[PDB]
Design a protein around this ligand. Structure first.
Ligand code: HEM
Ligand SMILES: O=C(O)CCc1c[nH]c2ccccc12
Length: 346
């Protein structure tokens, strides 16, 4: 629950985070490192509650990401971080690194907001995931209920409508990014804060738009267990254990089970096609069209950011993929809209 994490400052870093964008702007790597050492000596993370460790992972993660921006592996330099992060990871049962959950919904609104830089373009990513994530999560719960409901039941269509409504939040989030974040300023000023960090022999990618649980929607709604060697399934496979634990069993189940649409494709061609059954199948295509209204503008944005003109020193997002990945997720989704449009043609 996000409001009880956002209000916490378990490492007393609030004043520091008002200095951070200037610290980062003047490349003051010594205050960064001095703060990491101070933390591993001023706090026994073992005594933390779950909410405390989640907010600590947010704050420590961003200081760590700021050191890695300059090119220094932060745990390699402050060796005592490794057991500190170990202990945080045990309490949270999440990666010893911040994700878009800590960057968005668990990031406080207003004066306490944790930001890497003074550029207003940064706000376009934070607001983007802070809006997207709550609505996808609600859609996730509602979409899971469609499996155990008949197309002919109005309850099916009302759940799918509520889910398409909640997914629109991700549209609102990506529209907020498109208006606030300059593709050039992002690549040159923001992107280098989301680079991999080596912690205990493993490398943990930085925060990413792709960490919003939208892929969980995908897996349950249309991907399921039908594209076993996809590159999309490998990304999801790599994402499962970055998600909060609450979401992992849904995602694992859905990867191992036929999708809602694939089953509802079957029930449709095997039952008395009533008027409610078509409304029900039309509410599935509504959800998918809401996904398209997100992926289409998202694609253009990453395309402008990664053009020769604006890409700066990168050719990939923080998860290591080019725009080819988004093109592939978008075509998957487009093709799903074509299959439903076909089932519905009469
Ligand atoms: C300048 C802004 C942005 C750029 C250049 C960008 C670019 C990318 C890239 C390159 C990927 C491939 C995965 C990776 O390597 O990280 C990706 C994936 C993804 N990103 Fe973005 N992104 C931006 C903003 C956002 C925001 C604000 C959100 C959420 C509100 C978001 C949501 C996603 C999602 C859901 C995926 C998974 C693929 C899909 O579902 O289409 N992105 N993005
Ligand atoms: O999603 C990506 O991989 C690139 C966009 C991106 C990097 N860090 C981010 C943090 C929050 C929201 C979006 C991003």
């Amino acid at each position: 629950i996000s409001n009880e994490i956002s209000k916490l400052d378990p490492l007393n870093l609030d004043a520091f985070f008002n200095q951070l964008p200037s610290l980062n702007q003047n490349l003051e790597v010594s205050l960064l490192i001095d703060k990491l050492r101070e933390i591993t000596k001023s706090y026994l993370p073992t005594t933390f509650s779950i909410n405390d460790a989640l907010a600590a992972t947010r704050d420590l993660g961003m200081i760590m990401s700021s050191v890695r921006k300059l090119g220094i592996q932060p745990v390699s330099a402050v060796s005592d971080l490794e057991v500190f992060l170990e202990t945080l990871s045990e309490i949270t049962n999440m990666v010893p690194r911040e994700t878009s959950y800590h960057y968005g919904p668990w990031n406080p609104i207003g004066e306490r907001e944790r930001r890497f830089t003074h550029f207003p373009d940064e706000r376009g990513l934070i607001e983007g995931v802070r809006i997207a994530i709550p609505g996808i999560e609600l859609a996730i719960r509602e979409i899971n209920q469609l499996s155990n409901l008949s197309l002919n039941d109005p309850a099916f269509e009302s759940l799918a409508k509520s889910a398409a409504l909640h997914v629109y939040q991700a549209v609102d989030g990506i529209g907020e990014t498109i208006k606030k974040t300059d593709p050039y300023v992002f690549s040159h000023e923001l992107r280098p804060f989301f680079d991999p960090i080596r912690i205990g022999g493993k490398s943990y990618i930085g925060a990413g738009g792709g960490q919003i649980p939208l892929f969980v929607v995908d897996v349950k709604l249309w991907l399921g267990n039908h594209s076993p060697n996809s590159e999309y399934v490998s990304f999801i496979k790599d994402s499962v254990f970055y998600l909060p634990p609450e979401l992992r069993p849904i995602c694992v189940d859905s990867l191992l089970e036929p999708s809602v649409i694939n089953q509802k494709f079957a029930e449709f061609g095997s039952v008395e096609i009533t008027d409610q059954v078509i409304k029900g199948m039309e509410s599935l295509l509504s959800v998918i069209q809401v996904l398209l209204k997100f992926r289409k503008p998202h694609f253009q944005l990453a395309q402008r950011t990664l053009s020769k003109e604006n890409r700066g020193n990168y050719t990939t997002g923080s998860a290591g993929y080019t725009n080819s990945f988004n093109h592939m997720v978008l075509e998957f989704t487009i093709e799903v809209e074509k299959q439903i449009r076909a089932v519905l043609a009469p």
